[PDB]
């Protein structure tokens, strides 16, 4: 199967170091005279690219914002098939979804494969993992609250992803406090409630988190 | 060099509209433009590529042309779905070469059949409130346009604090999803008999109640 996807930290604090690491497979016929970028792209606004690196040549480049040209550095692994990107002196005003993108050669270029994206938070608060809360229930609803956690972000499944219709997970509120909280909840025949088990699974990969919650009938249900 | 792109762009389902993308010489001039559709909060998708090329699996209804130094994305036909931002690029030759990104355009298709919120009210969990806290937790999806405001009530009276809100997001079936939550201690919620999430969308409004319950 065709892939191209980052990893690394989600957290890293102002003035250190950033590494990412984009991993790839699955189309290793169509590699000759490849490139793959980094883009990024803050909350709520632009795509911004920040570097360009040559599969098969040995040529690279950076974009010339004076804010970043000094602090950004692109390379390859071609045993692995990655591209690792490492940003210095990161600041709060750094903190975005990363994306690596890959310029295949056919002077026609263009980003035709992404990534999923990895989101990064420049901050110098610590990680919290969450605390998760169940919300009990022709349909009901049920769900679970996952409190109090940073960095972003967090994801959730139910019944270890086979269950999948009727989900929704919402997108996290951010408190004053400067930690999020976020709910997801499944939409289910009520008759089921009493031959099917619900158990969200939460997954906080920041704080290497992981939770699973049985949500059960209401207590004191009067 | 920058590329410059409209802010914003609408039309009404099955009209036909553009978005324009100005550059320079050394970018658009010289080079091949592509355009990415983006649904905020997911990675973009290559659209158009080599000024006039659709990629594979993209809807015949997308076209891109370029003449001088501006580049047009065209959509012959508007659907629900074209909600999105979408970005032109192009390489640039000029200092020691880079890419450069135009700053997106927020497409709105107006005149869309309304859809109304479908709203889910829950109580503080006992474990919540075994922990010293109570969190009311509405949930609000399945809407279009995206904007809804929350009013919350304990018994009749407007809560004056301890409300946080999301903004909208869109959903991936195109409709817009967020949450309100209210936060209590548990004394303040046990001090009235039920409280209230109501959801105005586009002049409607609409109402879910929950009420403490005490076991002893």
């Known amino acids: 199967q065709v892939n191209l996807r980052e990893s690394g930290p989600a957290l890293v604090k102002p003035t250190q170091t950033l590494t990412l690491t984009c991993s790839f497979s699955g189309f290793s016929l169509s590699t000759s005279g490849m490139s793959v970028s980094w883009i990024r792209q803050p909350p709520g606004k632009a795509l911004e690219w920040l570097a360009l690196?040559?599969?098969?040549?040995?040529?690279?480049?950076?974009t010339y914002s004076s804010s970043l040209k000094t602090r950004l550095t692109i390379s390859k692994d071609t045993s692995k098939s990655q591209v690792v990107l490492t940003m210095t002196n990161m600041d709060p005003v750094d903190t975005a979804t990363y994306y690596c993108?890959?310029?295949?050669?056919?002077?026609?270029?263009?980003?035709?494969?992404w990534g999923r994206g990895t989101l990064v938070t420049v901050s110098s608060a610590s990680t919290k993992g969450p605390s998760v809360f169940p919300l009990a229930p022709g349909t009901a609803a049920l769900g679970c609250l996952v409190k109090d956690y940073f960095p972003e972000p967090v994801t959730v499944s139910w019944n270890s992803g086979a269950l999948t219709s009727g989900v929704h997970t919402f997108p996290a509120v951010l408190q004053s406090s400067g930690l999020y909280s976020l709910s997801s909840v499944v939409t289910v025949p009520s008759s089921s409630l009493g031959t099917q088990t619900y158990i969200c699974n939460v997954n906080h990969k920041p704080s290497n988190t992981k939770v699973d919650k049985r949500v059960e009938p209401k207590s004191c249900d009067k | 060099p920058v590329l410059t792109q409209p802010p914003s762009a609408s039309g009404t389902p099955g009209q036909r509209v553009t978005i324009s993308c100005s550059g320079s010489?050394?970018?658009?001039?010289?080079?091949?433009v592509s355009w990415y559709q983006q649904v905020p909060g997911t990675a973009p998708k290559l659209l158009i590529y080599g000024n006039n090329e659709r990629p594979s699996g993209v809807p015949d209804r997308f076209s891109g042309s370029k003449s001088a130094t501006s580049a047009s994305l065209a959509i012959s036909g508007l659907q629900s779905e074209d909600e999105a931002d979408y970005y032109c690029?192009?390489?640039?030759?000029?200092?020691?070469?880079?890419?450069?990104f135009g700053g997106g355009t927020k497409l709105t298709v107006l005149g869309q059949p309304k859809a109304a919120p479908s709203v889910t009210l829950f109580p503080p969990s006992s474990e919540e409130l075994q922990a010293n806290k109570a969190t009311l937790v509405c949930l609000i999806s399945d809407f279009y346009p995206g904007a809804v405001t929350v009013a919350w009530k304990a018994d009749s009276s407007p809560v004056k604090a301890g409300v946080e809100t999301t903004t909208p997001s869109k959903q991936s079936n195109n409709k817009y999803a967020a949450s309100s939550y209210l936060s209590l201690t548990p004394e303040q919620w046990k001090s009235h008999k039920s409280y209230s999430c109501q959801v105005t969308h586009e002049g409607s409004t609409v109402e879910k109640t929950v009420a403490p319950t005490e076991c002893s």
């Open positions: 690196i040559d599969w098969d040549d040995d040529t690279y480049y950076i």
């Open positions: 690029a192009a390489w640039d030759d000029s200092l020691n070469g880079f890419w450069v």
């Open positions: 010489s050394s970018n658009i001039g010289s080079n091949t």
């Open positions: 993108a890959r310029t295949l050669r056919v002077y026609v270029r263009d980003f035709d494969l």
